[PDB]
Design a protein around this ligand. Structure first.
Ligand SMILES: [Mg+2]
Ligand SMILES: [Mg+2]
Ligand SMILES: [Mg+2]
Lengths: 97, 147, 205
RNA sequence: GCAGAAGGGCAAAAGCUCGCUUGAUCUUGAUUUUCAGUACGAAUACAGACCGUGAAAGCGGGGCCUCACGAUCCUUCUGA
RNA sequence: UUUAAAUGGGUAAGAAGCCCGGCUCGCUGGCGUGGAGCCGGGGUGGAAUGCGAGUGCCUAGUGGGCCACUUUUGGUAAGC
RNA sequence: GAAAGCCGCCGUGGCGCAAUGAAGGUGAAGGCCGGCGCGCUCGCCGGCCGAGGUGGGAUCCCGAGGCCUCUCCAGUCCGCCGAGGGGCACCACCGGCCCGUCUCGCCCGCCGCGCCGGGGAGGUGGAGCACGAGCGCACGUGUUAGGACCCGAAAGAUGGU
RNA sequence: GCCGUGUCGGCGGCCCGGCGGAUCUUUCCCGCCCCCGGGGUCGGCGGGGGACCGUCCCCCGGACCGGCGACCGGCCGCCGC
RNA sequence: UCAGUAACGGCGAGUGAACAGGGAAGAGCCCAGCGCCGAAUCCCCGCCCCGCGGGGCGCGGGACAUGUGGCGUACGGAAGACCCGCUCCCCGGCGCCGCUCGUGGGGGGCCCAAGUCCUUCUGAUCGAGGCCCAGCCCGUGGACGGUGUGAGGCCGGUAGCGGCCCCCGGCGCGCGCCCGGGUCUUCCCGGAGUCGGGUUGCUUGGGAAUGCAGCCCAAAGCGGGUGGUAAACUCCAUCU
């Protein structure tokens, strides 16, 4: 009993299976390039704000450190990833001691 | 055609049809819709009530494809088909009912209107008004929705 | 300057428009120019078809037009794969290929594939010399003609259903009504709030 | 005397004291007044609601009446 | 200002009326009430004199006026 | 011949046939008979039809009666026809119906019983309905915008000698 | 000889007819899905015919006018040479 | 066409798009990188292979270049290892013949028919005339000049009319290039002071910033961009 508009809209058809195209996969971690970047964090060093952010992240505040990232990196969807990947680098040192 | 018009007819009369006194100059009352608020107020109104201000909500980038519902009301419904059938589907045997789908004719909605004749009908449309389908379910007809 | 009952007007003439006018005093003289650009191109190439390659079958993408069928751009790139022809011989066979196209339903897939496996069946090619690698005999005894017009396999052929005559059954003349559309709207816009009250049911514990 | 400018109106009163009191409330229209026969404003009779008063019929949607005020855009607050 | 002229203004001088008979009604309500409404039936000559009237459309020109008896306002008075 | 002719599985498309609403959206038929559930102002059912009624309304139809060398025997006719019937277009009114809000109210429906749909009766708002009249083309008139009936400045601006 | 309009018939040319028809037929004919090397029409789908109508083509038969649709003979009454 | 619409605007005057849809046209690709091939690459100089109107592939010198030349590769994937059944090419020049759709293009040079009688005049191209073929030619009655008004007096027009002179694309020997496809298995997979964000100006219909720029802070890998009302979460789509 199909219908014009609602939850089950319009013409019900068969959803043909298909492989995803090759440009749809643009940003997987691709381990060799992961090795290049994780080689380069410990030779090139860290950004001057994040060397200040990780002395904020542990003892000054825990919320204000993201708001400190929220103003220097663009938005809140870009500020959570920077906040939690520092807290893993700062967990890759603190817990490997 | 320059013969039939007035500037041959009014060639010799000195003021040429615009007064000795007003003596039509260039733009006496402002150009275009000038002064709809102030001095052409009585003329902007009475003849255009509603002209000044907001009335509704904005809809940024409306697309003229999704408000698209061309509407047949039932008195144009038998003339989508060949009339060779509506006499044929009226032969006294049974409920030999033909389909009449408006969506292969360019219509999406069946609106109500009285005076449908007494043959049994099935109608494929995407939208029905509740006056319209009771005008079909009273002639022994059915109302099959599809999209 | 406005007078008795009339129309308020906004003509777009305050901008200087007497320089950007485009008279069409040559619109005959271009039609007799671009027929010569076809007639000295229809005979110029070949008994290969004019009016371009074989174009796909494509359904129009809006609520307004999704009941009709349009000639499109190219076989998407798995029709070349289902019919089993290489993707870079397809445009020198004479089939048009659109690379970036999706397909997500078999209901519109097979109407291209049925066309595409039928095209090559109604096709003949020419040999260099008749060694004929994958070609049969002389092409139909010199192919009966030379060239087609305005589409090889008539790209619209918009086809329709019959449903010749039925019998009203019981349910069919009862259910599928106006109230089968209202609550379809009254639920699909109230789908989220009613699950939000079905989030509150848990915290009553 | 009726708050105030005049004119009109008023005596078991529209005045003067007394007793309650919120009809200076919500609501859709019609009409009158300057009128082009527009609008603001003011006013008139009504109708549906809730009330006040009175024992009652009633009267009362501001001042006894003729003036006391103000569009579009914008801002603000409230109402389902 | 008690009185109150002449001229002036409104209305009326019939069938769109009048009468009788009967049905609706949630209005009104001692009361086949009151009042509207509708249906059917009965009788055209209802002051003078003159004349063919009704209704819709589009829109030009005009928006600087002056003079005369008569009644008047400013002004001493004026072709003010 | 920059003409003319044809296309129609070239009607895509314009404008019209469907209005209202801010918007989600909704989207124009009553009549007559009979039978009924407290016929209870509410309401339920089949049937015949079918665009409702009132007052005017050109025209058309019936038309008592009359009208010819003598009175009684009949035919197509004609002309004057009193009264009466059907009533176009339209004009005024009353009703109905569609949509927007508001007062009052009870009922039903189930892709699944809910701050769910549907309906009713009153009163208003609408560029609506009530058997559609539009599109194309040409011409005239008028209004606007374009140097816009012709002529006219003191200026202003860029770029230069 | 004629042509109009309605009545049809010879279905006469339909299977060697014109155009048209979202009228018809799952015993007709191809490319397939549904079910267990096949099949069940088991529901069809993309496609072809042939049946019915709706309008046009001859026959004989009918009507009515022989009409600007024209000739035949015969008649009256003209006309030149 | 959508459209004078959505939108913008002392929401005044005014300005004002796009997506669908229909047609003309229709053509797609490469490189960096990632990894492999003993730089397998290019330039120049000189000599001769040997030919026009000149450049090639030979050979030896010199320079580039390892901070990366050339081959295969490009996001629809690609490589590599298979394994299976196919198949062995194209392209340039060289000489030409055989063509060429208005029959490729240019150039020069030619192609029918009355001045016959009479008449008028400064002068005819005027007016009249031509046996049973209607005097003559007509695929040639466009035009211009000729002492005035001409199918026939002369250039020319008509004609898949002609003859010439040069140039125009596509047969055919000598060169140069020269294994593609599918199936399964492993491997590789991308452009940074840029995107975004803030603030300021210009602009646009773009309205809580459409475009673009300055300045500052400055990215990420299940990442990033967009989805037309700013922000947070979640889901889905699409592109790189
Ligand atoms: Mg005038
Ligand atoms: Mg004037
Ligand atoms: Mg200056």
């Amino acid at each position: 009993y199909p219908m014009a508009v609602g939850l089950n809209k319009g013409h019900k058809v068969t959803k043909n299976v298909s492989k995803p195209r090759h440009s749809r996969r643009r940003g997987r971690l691709t381990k060799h390039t992961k090795f290049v970047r994780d080689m380069i964090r410990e030779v090139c060093g860290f950004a001057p704000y994040e060397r200040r952010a990780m002395e904020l992240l542990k003892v000054s505040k825990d919320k204000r450190a993201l708001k400190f990232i929220k103003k220097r990196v663009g938005t809140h969807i870009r500020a959570k990833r920077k906040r939690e990947e520092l807290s893993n680098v700062l967990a890759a040192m603190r817990k490997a001691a | 055609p320059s013969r039939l018009r007035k500037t041959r007819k009014l060639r010799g009369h000195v003021s040429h049809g615009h007064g000795r006194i007003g003596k039509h100059r260039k733009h006496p009352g402002g150009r275009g819709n000038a002064g709809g608020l102030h001095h052409h107020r009585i003329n902007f109104d009475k003849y255009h009530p509603g002209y000044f201000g907001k009335v509704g909500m904005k809809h940024y980038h409306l697309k003229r494809n999704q408000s698209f519902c061309p509407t047949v009301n039932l008195d144009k419904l038998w003339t989508l088909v060949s009339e060779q059938t509506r006499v044929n589907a009226a032969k006294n045997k049974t409920g030999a009912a033909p389909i009449i789908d408006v969506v292969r004719s360019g219509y999406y909605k069946v609106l109500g209107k009285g005076k449908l004749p007494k043959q049994p009908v099935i109608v494929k449309a995407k939208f029905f008004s509740r006056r319209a389908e009771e005008k079909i379910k009273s002639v022994g007809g059915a109302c099959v929705l599809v999209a | 300057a406005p007078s008795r009952n009339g129309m308020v007007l906004k003509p777009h003439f305050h901008k200087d428009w007497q320089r950007r006018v485009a008279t069409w005093f040559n619109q005959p003289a271009r039609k007799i120019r671009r027929r010569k650009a076809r007639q000295a191109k229809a005979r110029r190439i070949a008994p290969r078809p004019a009016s371009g390659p074989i174009r796909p079958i494509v359904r129009c993408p809006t609520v307004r037009y999704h009941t009709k069928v349009r000639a499109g751009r190219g076989f998407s790139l798995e029709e070349l794969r289902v019919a089993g022809i290489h993707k870079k011989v397809a445009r020198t066979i004479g089939i048009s290929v659109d690379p970036r196209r999706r397909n997500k339903s078999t209901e519109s897939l097979q109407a291209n594939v049925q066309r595409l496996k039928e095209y090559r069946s109604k096709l003949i090619l020419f040999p260099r010399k008749p060694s004929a690698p994958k070609k049969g005999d002389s092409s139909a005894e010199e192919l009966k003609l030379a060239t087609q017009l305005t589409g090889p396999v008539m790209p619209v052929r918009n086809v329709y259903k019959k449903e010749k005559a039925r019998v009203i059954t019981e349910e069919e003349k009862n259910f599928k009504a106006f109230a089968s559309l209202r609550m379809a709207r009254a639920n699909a816009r109230l789908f989220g709030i009613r699950a939000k009250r079905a989030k509150e049911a848990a915290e009553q514990d």
